[PDB]
Design a protein around this ligand. Structure first.
Ligand SMILES: Cc1cc2nc3c(=O)[nH]c(=O)nc-3n(C[C@H](O)[C@H](O)[C@H](O)COP(=O)(O)OP(=O)(O)OC[C@H]3O[C@@H](n4cnc5c(N)ncnc54)[C@H](O)[C@@H]3O)c2cc1C
Ligand SMILES: Cc1cc2nc3c(=O)[nH]c(=O)nc-3n(C[C@H](O)[C@H](O)[C@H](O)COP(=O)(O)OP(=O)(O)OC[C@H]3O[C@@H](n4cnc5c(N)ncnc54)[C@H](O)[C@@H]3O)c2cc1C
Lengths: 460, 458, 58
């Protein structure tokens, strides 16, 4: 039996941020997770592995399309195992760094499944048979989520995978079917298209990423189509059948598609069933999520939830966990993480912040559009990333930025300047900043300047 | 004899920006250049070729050190010509884009050397012997500069190069000597270190880039030393001897260094000799620069000078030209706070006061550090060396200086610059705690740095 | 002209927008619907919109 001030369940970004913020306040913190190593889904099955796969695919594509390396020989494909091999060193380094972060602050860890006993007591059970009783005054729930698994899909089939088991692939398939047009599905479709796999992306809606700007979605769809990705719209699956050599999907519309593999990316379910929320009066909705208020507080006053258990973004989860820890400690570090810069790490990347075009049109705001195309950008030309764009929506009278959308090379790393300018108050948030500020050159931030001018010419 | 409201000399960033801002005002503009193509040194001989060389060398290094590509075969050294070949497509695209920009706004161009006659006319002299007369109410001077050529150096020797003709190299040398520890010198030292050339960098001072922070300079020096860049400090050249099989530099201290090539990167002199400034009474200093006020206006009321002809940065020159054009048409700012950027391997960028200036001013500041080795994006980019430092006021949390060195340093520094320019309490460190970034990116490094500051704050 | 505005996303409007964009003028096509030529295929309309936007047709 151990006693602590605050106990956090799950060692993902939310749990790590909550524990670090709470221990920074002078309290005693503990962390519980079921994985054999620290890091959570973000490092072991989420952000890090898929991002390493994407970066390796991009490097392979650039090497193949670079004439300088064509003197070495004819273009050569790479096995999926060799591509995935690069992620092991990165995940090992990340887990080592996180363990060092925990150890340097004297943070106690327990590597076992956590179950609830009462409002202040939990039992951690390891695989071997640890049965340790933990009592804490404050609780943080950061158990994340898992891929949604419908019953009628034989996930035990060797040729059917989800967003987690897809990394178990040993050989590169010739054909692939991806279901669900979510962020994960689009990212994996882009990665496998870069690898050279004819993948037939399936969408339940008519437009990919309807929450994004219409032009950005159109450009992404066109690029995917030009990159061997076949996009089908307004489709719902009827039956998935595994075979010896492939997987056949029968849609409700009547189309039957056969591939050499299958990936499911349609939604996620909260990983809270094993916790046993009935011992504290808490309940989980149909998606497995936990309802929280603006203070990230559950129905129980001393129990808090943050992260994927409620935009399902790793940075958003980390900030939500830190805010929940601040609410626990009440050290003027609480904030409701609501404005999250949307980022899709396809090839090329996509990012957005603030209002889109359709919302502005619906609200009848007198705005204007400033565009800067990456094809004319020195850095984009020099990186051989010719495709791309940057769009700035700015108020036509007050010159206040209402939304920034970018699609191309280094989208996420240049959306941040627009985000910083947008967050300013009143006249401080002005497009004219991009004219009265000297940037570097040749970089991607220079596009902002061009975009600004492309707005100012449209202003009379 | 043509007539326009405003004429521009030089088609670099300063001239292009001045012309664009002037034509935006509804006036009539003209441009003159002595090169057969538009763009200036920013595209033809300066920024773009060196950046292309840097990106190609970085890609070569990434391919060489990547275990995935090693299965194909053993590393193969790439000739300098093949590496430089990638720049031709980029310069062609840039010049086509700039020509389209000029033609879209109906901008007249004159491909010839410009000479002054009086305060309202100039003569354009072509290669085959013309004079064309141009008259403008307002004048913009953006003649830029050229590499400084001392008399005692035989630049006509095939084995002796400057910052311009170094691109004429056809074979990769084994050993190379760089004189001058300037931005260009350090950049080219990094380039040739990436290509496996035993560079012997020569510095006239004791510390590389003394205008930078001590920590950043020390890290850059350590990386260069680990990348075969033998750095010699406090050295002044005495004589240069060009052999058939090499170049031997005899220093004032008595050291004699032999290489297979030689590169001079010590300073630049403004292009004012052939401008005929004596026809207007304007005066240029020994450095070839033109003195202007805060309006970017010369002593003559209707003559303006902007750009490298006066921080010598392409973006700074472009903004200076646009500011001068705005001053002509009345939308004007003085380009003073230029974020310094050195595009070596890895890159360096900085904005605001350094730690030494803050110590001298006795401002009670504090340091927040975020090391790239622990950064997920840096680890996944295989580029682990690097750091990001934020200097913030201890009491009011006001950011007084941002320094970054590593991967994507120049693009990273822009967020800190954007926060910096805010007024009063808006420019606060706690912004990095009150905003969610994209992950995994290097921008998250800022967040870490902020926390590394807040722990030191009590 | 230096700039131009086209109202109506019909066949004639799109043809003139493409022609003028080829001529090198910033055309601002205005549509009463959410998709250009909704009676066409979605992929074809998306490709046409991408090309027009890439050719200064806002
Ligand atoms: C392929 C892919 C790519 C992604 N890319 C991005 C991206 O680029 N950016 C982004 O922001 N997000 C991305 N995500 C989303 C990311 O996975 C989540 O945002 C993030 O993992 C949520 O953080 P969290 O700490 O709140 O939850 P998690 O990190 O998922 O926390 C779950 C942890 O709790 C443990 N746990 C769960 N239940 C129990 C239990 N009963 N007992 C004990 N331990 C338990 C798990 O073992 C795990 O360690 C991606 C996801 C996927 C699948
Ligand atoms: C190797 C190298 C790398 C560099 N890298 C960078 C970098 O990464 N970032 C950065 O910001 N800066 C960089 N620079 C500096 C960059 O070259 C200058 O900042 C830039 O030239 C400034 O613009 P400008 O128009 O004043 O210069 P220029 O472009 O040189 O303008 C001068 C133009 O006018 C013409 N001209 C000159 N004299 C006359 C005359 N008498 N009559 C008519 N026309 C004339 C010239 O032919 C030229 O076209 C680099 C320079 C070098 C040499």
């Amino acid at each position: 039996v151990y006693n602590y001030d605050v106990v956090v369940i799950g060692t993902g970004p939310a749990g790590e941020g909550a524990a670090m913020n709470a221990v920074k306040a002078g309290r005693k913190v503990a962390v519980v997770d079921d994985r054999p190593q620290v890091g959570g889904n973000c490092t072991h099955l989420g952000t890090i592995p898929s991002k390493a796969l994407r970066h390796s695919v991009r490097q392979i594509m650039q090497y193949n399309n670079n004439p300088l390396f064509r003197q070495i020989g004819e273009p050569r494909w790479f096995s999926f195992a060799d591509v995935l091999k690069s992620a092991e060193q990165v995940i090992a380094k990340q887990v080592s760094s996180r363990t060092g972060y925990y150890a340097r602050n004297r943070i106690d860890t327990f590597f076992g499944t956590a179950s609830f006993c009462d409002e202040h007591t939990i039992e951690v059970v390891h695989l071997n048979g640890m049965v340790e009783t933990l009592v804490a005054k404050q609780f943080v729930i950061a158990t994340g989520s898992r891929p949604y698994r419908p019953a009628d899909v034989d996930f035990t089939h060797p040729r059917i995978y989800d967003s987690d088991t897809i990394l178990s692939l040993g050989h590169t398939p010739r054909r692939l079917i991806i279901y669900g047009a979510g962020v994960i599905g689009c990212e994996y479709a882009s990665i496998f298209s870069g690898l050279g796999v004819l993948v037939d992306l399936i969408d339940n809606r008519d437009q990919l990423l309807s929450f994004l700007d219409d032009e950005i979605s159109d450009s992404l769809s066109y690029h995917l189509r030009n990159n061997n990705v076949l996009i089908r719209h307004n489709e719902e699956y009827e039956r998935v059948e595994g075979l010896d050599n492939g997987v056949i999907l029968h849609l409700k519309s009547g189309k039957k598609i056969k591939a050499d593999a299958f990936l499911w990316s349609n939604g996620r379910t909260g990983n809270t069933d094993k916790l046993g929320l009935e011992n504290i009066g808490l309940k989980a909705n149909g998606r497995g999520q936990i309802q929280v208020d603006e203070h990230y507080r559950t129905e129980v006053s001393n129990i808090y939830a943050a992260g994927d258990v409620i935009p399902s973004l790793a940075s958003a989860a980390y900030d939500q966990g830190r805010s929940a820890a601040g609410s626990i400690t009440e050290n003027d570090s609480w904030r409701f993480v609501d404005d999250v810069p949307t980022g899709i790490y396809t090839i090329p990347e996509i990012s957005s912040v603030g209002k889109t075009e359709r919302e502005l049109t619906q609200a009848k705001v007198p705005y204007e559009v400033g565009k800067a195309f990456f094809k004319g950008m020195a850095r984009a030309q020099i990186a051989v990333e010719k495709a791309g764009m940057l769009k700035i929506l700015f108020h036509r009278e007050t010159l206040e930025i209402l939304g920034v959308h970018c699609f191309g090379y280094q989208a996420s790393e240049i959306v941040h300047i627009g985000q910083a300018i947008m967050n300013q108050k009143g006249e401080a948030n002005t497009l004219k900043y991009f004219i009265n500020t000297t940037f570097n050159y040749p970089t991607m931030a220079e596009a902002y300047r061009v975009a600004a001018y492309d707005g100012l010419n449209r202003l009379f």
